[PDB]
A paper describes a structure:
The best improved variant, αsD6, exhibits a 2,210-fold increase in catalytic efficiency against methyl-parathion. Interestingly, some selected variants retained a strong preference for oxono-phosphotriesters (~10-fold), whereas others such as αsD6 lost the thiono-effect. Interestingly, the improved variants do not exhibit significant difference in KM values for thiono-phosphotriesters, but show a dramatic increase in kcat values, as compared to wild-type enzymes (e.g. kcat value of 6.89 s−1 and 1.10 × 10−3 s−1, as compared to methyl-parathion for the αsD6 variant and wild-type enzymes, respectively). The two selected variants, namely αsB5 and αsD6, which lost the thiono-effect have only two mutations in common: V27A and Y97W. Both residues are located relatively close to the bi-metallic active site, yet do not interact directly with the metals (V27-Fe: 6.7 Å, Y97-Co: 4.3 Å). While most structures were solved at high or medium resolutions (1.4–2.55 Å), mutant asD6 could only be solved at low resolution (2.95 Å). Given this resolution, we limited our interpretations and retained this data for the consistency of the study as it exhibits structural features (loop 8 disorder) that are consistent with all the other mutants. In the two other mutants, αsD6 and αsB5, loop 8 could not be modeled due to the lack of electronic density, which was likely to be due to the high level of motion of this enzyme region. Given both its catalytic proficiency and high thermal stability (Tm = 82.5 °C), αsD6 is a promising candidate for organophosphorus compound bioremediation and, in particular, the decontamination of water runoffs, soils, food products and materials.
Phosphotriesterase-like Lactonases (PLLs) are appealing candidates, being natural lactonases endowed with promiscuous phosphotriesterase activity. PTEs and PLLs belong to the amidohydrolase superfamily, and share the same (β/α)8 barrel topology. SsoPox exhibits high acyl-homoserine lactones and oxo-lactones hydrolysis abilities, and promiscuous, low phosphotriesterase activity. SsoPox is a very appealing candidate for the bioremediation of phosphotriesters because of its unique thermal stability, and its ability to resist aging, solvent and protease treatments.
Author numbering:
A (entry chain D): 1 to 259, 272 to 314
B (entry chain A): 1 to 259, 274 to 314
The structure:
């Protein structure tokens, strides 16, 4: 209909349901695995992904959006292999995940050839299959907006324009790279409301998060559990403030989980065991959290 | 007995034969190929690799060292798939090809763990097979010696210590990164005569090339055909001068070919360099030094 699924017929924007917007089934470095298969376990990765997903479906999750692309080891075979075993709505995307420079393949070649790769996934299929991409993923971090990074950003804009699919981003919360990605995408003609700026839940500075939201774009409070970036209690503190400041129309929650001495209670359900119960406790009607997990993904893919 | 082959029983370090020390049957970037198979052809890629190798065998090539590692899309299944169609002595290796940073899988990692990856390919096997690595490959370029690049270099040393296999490198000729590779490896107890500093045939400055040869390291005149870095006539001009200055014992020639620069093929050396090289006062013994005896003592 509007949103393509992995191993399922496409569905309408409005049937997305309760949705975890940023979760990784598995995530590796293509080169490292292609060259040393002995370091991995196809069966253990598969199980860890199965019982984590179906646990999320028990809690009420209907749709998981997986932003695993090039540089994070996308594999629609493994994705459809785990959808068949769970029945989950898996939205796969396309894009490129880099911090500094991009592969030598792309050395000195056209920013429109990059976007053609995304377009290929969106319209034609992914990795030789009919599974199509529902979004495009881009990244930046400590380096931030390096010449090569910028090309990817800009290539996403093109793909958005040509296919209307939304854009999930990876950013660093402490170095303005999130705002920069928004600027460059808005400047290039991208509906601010089609942009999810991610990982900005790793900071206290609420003013920075608001400026991004005030400018039309979804804010990603999407790393619940990863206490090295921000403790759960401190993330919960913020999210509540942003709700009580009337920003629920642009808040998106997720875990950024990848199926320990400091990865404590990190999992694809930490939100239900702590986060949601904490909100309600501080008076936040099921309307204020259906917005976040149902209506915000609704208008994002609409 | 000494040097492990792809699809063949290990051979003795004295039986290398005529060898091309730096040739790539195929290279790509796993990230792009894993994500977009539609962009490649595992069949045309095979044919190009077949007829190019046997043409080198028809010029008298007995061994081909292939320094395709992580980042360049090493694939022993494709390598052994082309050895059964040619019968060529293919020496595969292990190591990491990067300029700045290495995969996110290598964050707060112990540079020994990096070494252990090489040692695994050397002693155990490559990509779940019994084909073993005969050398370790490292790189550096315009960015130079980054912190992460330096980790790879030092990890190759640890693999050298433990397995005694040689080290082939990729360097930029115009930024002292080759000398730095030798500087670090020697300072980490690496036998200077087990190191091949490559791509230094891309420059005129013979003084730079000598200082690397004078410290015990083989000099890689290994990109014949790639006129974009140096024209063939200017490489030949530069090789000859080094021979007649008594540096034949430390010279290794190759193409760095990947199955402007139009004459670039894996046999360009026989069609131009060799003929030229010996019409200008270069005996057959000294060319055997470069293509047989220098790979000999490199893998010895
Ligand atoms: Co991220
Ligand atoms: Co090279
Ligand atoms: Fe993520
Ligand atoms: Fe090479």
């Amino acid at each position: 209909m509007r949103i393509p699924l992995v191993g399922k017929d496409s569905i309408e924007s409005k049937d997305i349901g309760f949705t975890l917007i940023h979760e990784h089934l598995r995530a590796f470095s293509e080169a490292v695995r292609q060259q040393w298969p002995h370091l991995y376990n196809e069966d253990e990765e598969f199980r860890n992904a199965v019982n984590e997903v179906k646990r999320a479906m028990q809690f009420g999750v209907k749709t998981i959006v997986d932003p695993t692309v090039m540089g994070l080891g996308r594999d629609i075979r493994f994705m459809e292999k785990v959808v068949k075993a769970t029945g989950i709505n898996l939205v796969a995307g396309t894009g490129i995940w880099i911090y500094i420079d991009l592969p030598f393949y792309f050395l000195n070649r056209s920013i429109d050839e990059i976007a053609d790769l995304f377009i290929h996934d969106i319209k034609e299929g992914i990795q030789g299959t009919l599974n199509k991409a529902g979004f495009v993923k881009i990244a930046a971090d400590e380096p931030g907006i390096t010449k090569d990074v910028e090309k990817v950003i800009r290539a996403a804009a093109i793909a958005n324009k040509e296919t209307k699919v939304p854009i999930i981003t990876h950013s660093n919360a402490h170095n303005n790279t999130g705002l920069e990605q928004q600027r460059i995408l808005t400047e290039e003609g991208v509906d601010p409301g089609k942009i999810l700026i991610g990982h900005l839940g790793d900071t206290d500075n609420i003013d920075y998060i608001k400026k991004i939201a005030d400018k039309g774009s979804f804010i990603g409070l999407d790393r619940y559990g990863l206490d090295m970036f921000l403790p759960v209690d401190k993330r919960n503190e913020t999210t509540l403030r942003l709700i009580k400041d009337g920003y629920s129309d642009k808040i998106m929650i997720s875990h950024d989980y990848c199926c320990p001495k400091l990865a404590p209670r990190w999992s694809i359900t930490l939100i239900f065991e702590d986060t949601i119960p904490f909100l309600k406790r501080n008076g936040v009607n099921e309307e204020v959290i259906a917005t976040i997990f149902k209506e915000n993904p609704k208008k994002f893919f609409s």
